[PDB]
Amino acid sequence: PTRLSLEAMLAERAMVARQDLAGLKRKLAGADRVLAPQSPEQCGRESAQAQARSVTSELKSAVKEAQGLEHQTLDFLEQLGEYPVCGILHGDHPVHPSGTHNNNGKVSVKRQFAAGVNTSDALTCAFRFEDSDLVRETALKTTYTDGTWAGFVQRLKMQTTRKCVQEKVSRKLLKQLFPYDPQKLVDVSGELSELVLGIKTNAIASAGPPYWRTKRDALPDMLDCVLPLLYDHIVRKDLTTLRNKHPELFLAECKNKTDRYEVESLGEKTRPYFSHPFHLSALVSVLSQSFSGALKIMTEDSTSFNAYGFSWTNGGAEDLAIWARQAGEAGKKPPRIACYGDDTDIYYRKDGKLYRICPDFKQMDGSVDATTIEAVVDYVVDAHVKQYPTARQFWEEVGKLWVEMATQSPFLIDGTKVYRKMQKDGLMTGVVGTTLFDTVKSALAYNDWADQLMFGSLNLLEEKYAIEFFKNKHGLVIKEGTWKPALVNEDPGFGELWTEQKFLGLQLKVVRRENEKVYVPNLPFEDWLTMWVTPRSKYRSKETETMRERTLFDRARGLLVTGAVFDERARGLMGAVINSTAPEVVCMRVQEGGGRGAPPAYAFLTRDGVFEFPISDGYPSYDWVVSLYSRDHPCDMPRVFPEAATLIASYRKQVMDTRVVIK
Amino acid sequence: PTRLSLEAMLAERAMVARQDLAGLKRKLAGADRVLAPQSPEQCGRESAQAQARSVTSELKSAVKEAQGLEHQTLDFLEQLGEYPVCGILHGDHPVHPSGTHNNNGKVSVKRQFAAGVNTSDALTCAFRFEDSDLVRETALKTTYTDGTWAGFVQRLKMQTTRKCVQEKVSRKLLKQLFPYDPQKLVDVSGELSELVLGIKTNAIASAGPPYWRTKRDALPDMLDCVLPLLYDHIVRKDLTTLRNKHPELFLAECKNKTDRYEVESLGEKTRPYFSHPFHLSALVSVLSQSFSGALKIMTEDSTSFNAYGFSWTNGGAEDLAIWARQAGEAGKKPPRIACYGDDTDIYYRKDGKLYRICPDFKQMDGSVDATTIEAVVDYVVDAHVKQYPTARQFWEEVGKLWVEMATQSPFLIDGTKVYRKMQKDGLMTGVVGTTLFDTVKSALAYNDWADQLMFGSLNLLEEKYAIEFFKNKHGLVIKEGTWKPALVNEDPGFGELWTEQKFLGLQLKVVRRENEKVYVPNLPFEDWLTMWVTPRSKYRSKETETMRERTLFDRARGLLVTGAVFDERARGLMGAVINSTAPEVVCMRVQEGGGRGAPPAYAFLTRDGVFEFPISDGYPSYDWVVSLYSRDHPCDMPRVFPEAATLIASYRKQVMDTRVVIKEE
Ligand SMILES: Nc1ccn([C@@H]2O[C@H](COP(=O)(O)OP(=O)(O)O)[C@@H](O)[C@H]2O)c(=O)n1
Ligand SMILES: [Mg+2]
Structure with a gap:
């Protein structure tokens, strides 16, 4: 009765079984489990939760107090009045959505400084499995928060009013300091739609004015409507007329960065960044991402001062x-x-x-001078037009927009007043190319x-x-x-540090693999702990318990891979988190990492930034993590449940020989 | 900000968009629509539904009257008493689930002779777009129904008690009438698990006793538990012990076939068929499907009497x-x-x-003699063992099971009484290899x-x-x-028939492609109409209006491909349905056909039985269908909405040249 093979039927069955948590729970009940080394329980379930809640409550009070402080005036910025809401339509709708970011016809924003901090789940685990005083002390020093008005303005003032020094810099000098491979540069003489379709970005990031939606939501409006309009004014050398008629197309938004902050400086320090219009950032990203992909790093060319692109794994x-x-x-x-x-x-x-x-x-x-910024843009533009001269003039125009975005975009802060940085000096943090x-x-x-x-x-x-x-x-x-x-300990013994210092936020350590030295990242336990107990995530009440439990598992896998496996105490804590994760949570089908599990948050594991786990139900053993950092003696990622595939399939192959003698 | 390319962002967006019917409907609003040839509307929405309900009501009452007829006794079968419920455990559960098919510890079934028929949607379309009298008369002749107790027992008696003639038949004769390619036979001397995993079956068909679940549900119990138990007793020449201890493992169920039946004979004709244990049918399917895959057909070898495997498309x-x-x-x-x-x-x-x-x-x-059945099994077994002699003994044993299944399986009908066909003669319809x-x-x-x-x-x-x-x-x-x-019109002109007769339910016709003759399947309008107004599906309250509208669309495509596109009137009716399907339904993401839309019901378009539409949002035009039947590569399937993709993505590419001179130097 041919419809599908039993092989295919079995597969279909299994894929569906990993989505039935009740069924996973049943089928994995007596399963053999591989347990990570873990720290002993330090207190019971209720005590751990109460200690974490006490800490969270105190941090919330500290944030609320700091948020209540008056901020200084914004008089250090130039004020430009108000901008009309963009009225450009894309088919059936305005590109600037009705009834949003609109105060009586003028573009508007509202800064959010919420009282809520990160969630208590990770901290609860910390109290559950580690020293009460150390956990408490550590957790009270830092919190994930919106920051404060006072700290926001204070920091904004500092990086928009500092006296800078113009660098003495030329193409020749930048060539020596930042060598690159011209063959790796993108052919920017290609058609523009295709170039822009190749840039990568965060789908849920703000698309900025005039869209006031996420990038993935605003992507058709940007590509189909605003981008060709921008392009037409570029090539007709008529950007002035576009700016004057539709000023929202060139407006940025100045935002407070939600982040891990030291509790004691909340009132003095919140970091600002700028969110530019999507059409501008995506256009400029064609040059910026192409260049960064072509840059040599120091370890490839010893004349280079560039470590932008360096990463820790694979040697x-x-x-x-x-x-x-x-x-x-x-x-x-x-x-x-x-x-x-x-x-x-x-x-x-x-x-x-x-x-x-x-x-x-x-x-x-605040110290990045306009001369440096213009020279970088000129360096990057010239690199491309040297290799692809037929598109020189177009990208030179793009370069001018780039400089503007990095130094002089008008921006909103809170309400309708538009502001501009008084001097060209000072980099507008968050502009494309900020890192470079x-x-x-x-x-x-x-x-x-x-x-x-x-x-x-x-x-x-x-x-x-x-x-x-x-x-x-x-x-x-x-x-x-x-x-x-x-x-420097130039040839460290097993377990020894290179130095105690950090670079890219991590120490360098040597550990043993058989008799080989393997160089790996490392942190003191207290630093792993701070990261662990302050997840960059606000309390979401839409989050199921299963989701929260799975997050703890993924974050533990993440920290281990980043090198927490090489500190006994952090290893034991991440180990306890993993072991206390339910069988069905370990083995369920997950969405992040393309079904492989959420990648580690740490950004410099691989050069392209994209680390992927082999399997969503593996745990990071010491041996497996070590192999990620060696140039290689690799191994598979060990499964938490070695027999999960067949317990879930309800089938274990038995060889049945058809060639038997029956007589 | 690196996470994914705008290109991948676009694509992800558009996969999302095809699942949002509200959005599809809005974005497709005034879209350019390519219309299939259609018959014009002949009455309004309300008028169509009313006449459709009228007919449906008359059919249900006819079905109820026929189902109330007393049925003749089952004394013509041997009675074997009752069987004990199988107690074999697979891990944490019995292979025969608790509280099902169990009367006081004995295996039980109940035959379903439900009163409901097929739904009225398709008939409503028929009334909307075609002649009232003709649609009514056509729709009253035939109905999709469970049949009747009276007809079921009558056809069962006919099939199990007929005097057969034993054929004279040898391997030599079968070699002549049924040549095959020995190199196309599966290597049955390989490991059995892999062989069994290679057979194909219907995932939602019953797995039979002792599973009493669908084949996809029962599959691990069958594979991991029962099959190796079966294997072990086969190779120890010890099936007798297995049978005697666990007789549900060899029990079949005798079922009434829900089908299109003539209304006037409902009380005298309901087809029985038998549902065997999953482990048995799967094992034998290794030989049976290997063999059918190796058989030659008539048109490949002019000695062959075999059309089993013939298909209409591609010449x-x-x-x-x-x-x-x-x-x-x-x-x-x-x-x-x-x-x-x-x-x-x-x-x-x-x-x-x-x-x-x-x-x-x-x-x-009822006419298929045991001699013929044993000769076929022997022929199929021998074919494999000659080619793969190291597994001769195992498969000859499977051959014995096969013959038993085809002729003598004990079976339930209704309740706990176990029956068996008195004589070996007579084929137990639905056994693997029934067609062969x-x-x-x-x-x-x-x-x-x-x-x-x-x-x-x-x-x-x-x-x-x-x-x-x-x-x-x-x-x-x-x-x-x-x-x-x-x-026979041996070389029919354009639009002419070969004859008026049917083979595999279809006529043979010649039609014009450019100025070449292409041979195609065909039916008169009335036969297409009968099929259209009698879908093979019950009224399910689970189904949404979107799902129902889509089914109409898919079935219209299916009939067109099967050949209704070559009859002007049936073409017009299918086209009317397709053209009246809402844009969002035409263009939405669909699960069937692996995303390309439910394949046609008709089973002999291709030899493997699988036909796949190129796209879920295209329609079967004359040019596209006729290209399926000619040896020429099939042209494109035309889209109903040529701009749907760009419209759904809300993006239409514009060439923006980076090589422009902006300023004369
Ligand atoms: N209804 C649900 C519940 C949980 N989940 C899982 O919850 C997990 C989310 O936790 P996570 O550790 O991966 O990442 P974040 O929530 O910290 O961003 C995902 O792997 C989801 O597959 C789900 O997908 N759907
Ligand atoms: Mg465009």
Whole structure:
């Protein structure tokens, strides 16, 4: 009665069974389970939940108090009046949706500073399986929050009013500092629709004005309607008329960044960023994503100061060490300098011994000068038009929009008043290319620093003079106490640190794989703990209990992979979270990671940023994680339930031989 | 902000959009629509539904009257007492689920003779777009129904108690009449699990006793638990113990077939068929489906009597005519005879003129003798063991089970009494291999018929003598009036028939593509209309209006492809239905046909039975359908809404050139 094969029927059956949680629960009941090493229970279920709730309650009160503080005026910004709501229609609807972001015909926004913090689930697990005092102390220092009005304005003022230093910079110099492979550059002489369709972005991010919807929601309006209109005014050299008639098409929104913040500085520090119109960001992203994909990193070309694109897995961690060891004596041979946005790793030798410095810039975007920004854009544009000269003029026009977006877009903050940064200097954080602008500004300053070493100014190795130098000569503010050269353990033993310092937020450690040294990332337990108990997620009451339980599992898998497996205490905690995850939650069909489970939040595991788990019901063993970082002696990801496939299929193959003798 | 490309974002958006009927309806609002040829509306919505309800009401009352008829006794069967409910456990549960098919510990069933018929939607369309009197009369003749107790027992008695003639048949004769390709036989000397996982069946069919669930539900119980138990007793030559301990494992169920039945004979005719245990049918299916996949058909080998596997598309229809024309003068050269189950196409020449016969066998399964059945099994088993001798003993044992299933399975009918056919003769309809057993029995009889022509008995060309011959010499009953030779139009012009007769339920017709003849299937309007107004589905209250409207759309496509597009009137009716289908229903994401829309009901378009529409939102135009039947590659299926995709995506590409000179230097 041919309709489908039994093989196919069995598969269909199994795919449907992973969606029946009641059935999974039954079928996995006595299943053999592989248990992670885990910390012992420290208190009972109710106590863990009460301790977490007490902490959350205190943080909520701290946020509410800080949110109640008056903020300073916005008088440090230029004020431009009000913008009319865009009236452009795309078929049956306006591109600016009716009855939203509209105050009597004028574009409007409202800043959200909510009282709610992150959820208690992760913190409950922490109290359940770790030291009460340490958990409590750790959890009280940081919280995931909207921040505050006062802190928002304070930080906005700092990065829009700082006195900058114009860099001395040319194509020739940027070529030396940021070599790239021209063959990897996108053919921007291709047709524009196709180029823009190739850029990647966050589907649920704001599309900005005039759309006031997510990017995936606003994507047809942008592509089908606004983009060709923008294109027509570009090529007719008539952007002025478009700007004047439809100012919302060039308007940005200045927003408070919801983030992990130190509780004690909530009233002084909330980070601003800018959200630009989708058509502008997507157009410019054609150049910016093409360039970043073509950039060499330091470990590939030792003349390069670029670490933007560096990642830890597949030898990456060890690549850093090998590259760094080539650092020479200060004043004689080149140091090793790695820039990624506002993060830097500096190596030099004094009397033969390797030293490492990992300084912080204070609010770096405030120090990014207009000359650097224009030179970066010129560098990126010229790289493409050198390789693809027939599209030179179009992309040079795009370059001008890019500079504008990075330095001078008008923006809303709260209500209808439109603002503009008083000076071209200062980078408008969140503009496309933010990372590259930061990276370049950092490298230019540090390249000059290295030049001064060779000039014989060795006192620039010392915090006092280094800080003065970066301030007076580059307008950069290095945080006092963060210029602290440390002796490098150049060939660490098993379990030993490279140094105690962080780069890209992680320490470098050596661990054992058989008799091989494997270089891996690492953190102190307290830092894993802070991340764990402050998930970047607000309390969603639409979230089922199953979803919450599955989130804990995925986040634990994520932290382990990021290197929490290499700290006993974090390993034991993530292990307890995983072991306490129900069989049906482990094995259910999940949506994130394309059915493979939510990828780790940490962004620099792989260069393309996309880490994917092999299976949604695997757990990160030490052996498996180690193999992710080695250049390789790989292995599969171990399943939590080795027999899950057949318990779920209700079928275990028995060999039945048709060739038997019966007689 | 890297997460996914705008291109992938677009695509994801558009897959979402096709599931949002409100949005599809709005976006397709004033879209350009390509219309199929249609018959014009003949009455309003309300008028159509009213007349449809009128007919439906009359059918239900006719069905209820026929179902109230007392049925004759089942004394004609052997009675075997009652069977104990199977207690075999598969892990955490019994393979025979608790509280089902269990009367005080004995296996039980209840026959369903429900009063409801098919739904009225399609009939409403018929009334909306066609002649009132003709639609009413057509729709009253036939109804989709469970049948009756009275008709069911009457047809069961006929099928189980007929005097059969034992065929004279050897492997040599079957090799002649049923050649096959030995290299196309599955390697049955491979591991059994893999063999069984390769057979194909209907996921929602009953798995039979002891499962009492659908085959997809019962599948792990069958595969993981019962099958190896069966295997083990087979190889230990110990089936007797298994049978005696667990008799539900060999029990069948005798069922009434829900089908299209003639109203006036409802009380005398309801087809029985048998539902065997899943482990049994699956095991035997390894041989049976391997063999049917290896068989040659008539048009591949002119010695072959076999049409089992013939299909109409891709030149099939013309292959039949090409094969048929080779028929020679009766008594001097061989006829052309094609058998498919109980369906037969016969050609011979008389004074050089080609003639065609298309007779009907009455209740053929009652005439299939045990000798024929054992010869077919032996033939199929031998075919495999000659090619794969290392598994000879296992499969000969399966062959014994197969014969038992085909002739002697004990079975339930209604309640707990277990029955069995008294004589071995008579085929238990629905057993795996039913079609082949039927095909071989018929072929053996027509082969003998042909020889008698060659021996000089030319009076066997006439119904009176033919009917007598098939009765007396083969135990087969040819329906009076259906043996009527017809002059074949050997090379029909455009729009002309081959003859008016049917084979596999369809006529053969020639139509024009450009200026070439293409051979196609065809029916008169009335036969299409009968099929249209009697869908093979019950009234389910679970079904939404969207689902019902879509079904109409899909069934109209199905009939067009089957050949209704080649009859102007039926074409017009299907087109009217298709054109009156709402844009959102036409364009929505559909689950059937793997997303391309429910395939046609008709089972012999392709040899594998599977036909797949290219797209779910296209319609079957004359040009597209005619290309399915010619050997030329099928042209595109035309979209109902050529701009649906760009309209749904809300995006139409514009070329924007990056190489423009913006400023003269
Ligand atoms: N009705 C439900 C309930 C839970 N879930 C699962 O809940 C999980 C969400 O938790 P997660 O750890 O992966 O990620 P986030 O919720 O932290 O973003 C997904 O894997 C979903 O498959 C679901 O998909 N549908
Ligand atoms: Mg366009």
